[PDB]
Symmetry: C2
Subunit: 299 residues, 2 copies
């Protein structure tokens, strides 16, 4: 691929000379080297984006910042997530200039906006409201006001990962920003309150050592079921982005908080017309329907 090889060199050189390039500079660079048909242009650039060589965001697509130097965005992003001002997981964007230029690369006002946009795109942060961004992976491991949410025989539902990406909790906070109660959010979890199921209050917690995300829910019985339904829907969407996750869902056996049963086991047992779940390990028998009903109505 004689044309592709050249453009690579030319674009890498041009990206490290300037900080980034615009459509015109780029189009000319590949038309100089031969490549004209816009499909080819697009397939080459996306390709180099993947190979980490040169950065290209089809989601933003700004002419003046079309193709970026990777080193420039990494130092920028690094400086943001490593600032002393973001250590507790909060970012007052007023401080972006101080963070990026104070604490030899320069970042103008627009170049700051652009970095934030890349960060949003990679789901590393979100806007909470009053010019205050939250960076979930910088949130403290504990909070002083963390509620128990253990009080009223709550509904527990356990998600077991073969391997658990450290970005599931961040991504879930982004998904449900408007339902996080009183900044009740930490590195490993949230407190979520719903409006539409007047009542329903949920706590979602990740356990690194066990590769589990655990959902616990309080409120009226119909509410608890409906809110788990939505939280789990949100987590299913997040999980879908990872190629090789193996996630099994679990319910605690009644009276045995440490003994779990696979949720798809019980559906299976039902589909085949069994009402008994038999536990050899416990030498106890459990009702299939009663346990299914605690989580989901008759479908």
């Amino acid at each position: 691929a004689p044309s592709w090889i050249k453009v690579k060199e030319k674009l890498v050189e041009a990206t490290t000379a300037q900080r980034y390039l615009n459509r015109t500079e780029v189009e000319k660079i590949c038309n100089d080297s031969g490549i004209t048909d816009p499909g080819e242009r697009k397939t080459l650039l996306g390709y180099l984006n993947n190979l980490g060589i040169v950065l290209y965001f089809e989601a933003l697509d700004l002419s003046e910042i079309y193709v970026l130097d990777p080193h420039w965005v990494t130092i920028g992003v690094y400086r943001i997530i490593n600032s002393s001002k973001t250590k507790n997981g909060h970012l007052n964007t007023s401080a972006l200039g101080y963070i990026l230029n104070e604490e030899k690369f320069t970042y103008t006002l627009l170049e700051q906006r652009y970095l934030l946009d890349i960060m949003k795109q990679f789901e590393l942060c979100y806007d909470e409201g009053k010019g205050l961004f939250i960076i979930p992976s910088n949130l403290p491991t504990q909070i002083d006001n963390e509620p128990e949410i253990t009080e009223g025989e709550p509904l527990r539902f356990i998600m077991k990962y073969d391997y658990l990406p450290s970005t599931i909790i961040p991504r879930l906070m982004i998904a449900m920003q408007h339902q996080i109660l009183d900044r009740m959010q930490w590195r490993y979890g949230m407190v979520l309150k719903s409006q539409d199921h007047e009542g329903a209050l949920a706590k979602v917690v990740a356990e690194t050592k066990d590769s589990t995300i655990t959902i616990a829910i309080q409120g009226e019985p119909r509410c608890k079921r409906e809110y788990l339904s939505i939280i789990w829907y949100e987590i299913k969407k997040i999980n879908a982005n990872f190629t090789n996750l193996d996630v099994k869902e679990f319910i605690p056996l009644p009276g045995h908080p440490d003994e779990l049963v696979e949720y798809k086991e019980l559906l299976g047992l039902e589909k085949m017309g069994r009402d008994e779940y038999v536990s050899g390990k416990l030498e106890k028998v459990f009702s299939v329907s009663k346990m299914l009903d605690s989580v989901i109505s008759k479908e």
Copy 2:
């Protein structure tokens, strides 16, 4: 092969309202298409052609491939409900709107309702204001009573002239800048923005259909108005980049002559030429290229 798959998928998504991942894969295998790669692109194209719907950004096994019709009636009901005639949607009311309301026999379960909302967000037709209240910008009133004027100090005005002005631009800016919309000062053709960083700084962004125009007017100390304009313009350029044959030209008013515009790309040209004067023949007056540029950028 592809014909059979298309027909099989249409027949099924019609009968059932939508299909799950394994149901879809079976249909592909049965019809010869076994390769995971090929299968994904086939579904991409069916989606692009509106034959059968498929959302790679949601990508949910339970609700994988959908009947266009089932989705369409769903969102149409939401957009045309009496309870959303003013651009506000209560999410609690979703049940009623989708299932009970008489809008001039499709059921929608709680999760199906939620999925419809995601499709809508996905297509940039609404957003979460954040207390169970969504905003459907296209449904907002055409006029708001408390609509303020930007008149403090010497306001900075910047106009963007479109060859065609898509009606989606305002709704999309509202999405992009939801957190800076002041006191629900949002209508079908515009919004009011307070900046979080540039103390003071109040902007008003308006679409005028008749002259297919988008006007930004800003007030505050000079560095401020300049800095917010930068942000707002950037946000509009992003939205614009989504359209193929869009011809936007940017204009600035001449000081003391709100009706006389000069293209911003002109002033750039004159500067590269090394001319500091902009001569207005029609006004018989001469302005500074640098100084007018500086009131807008850098």
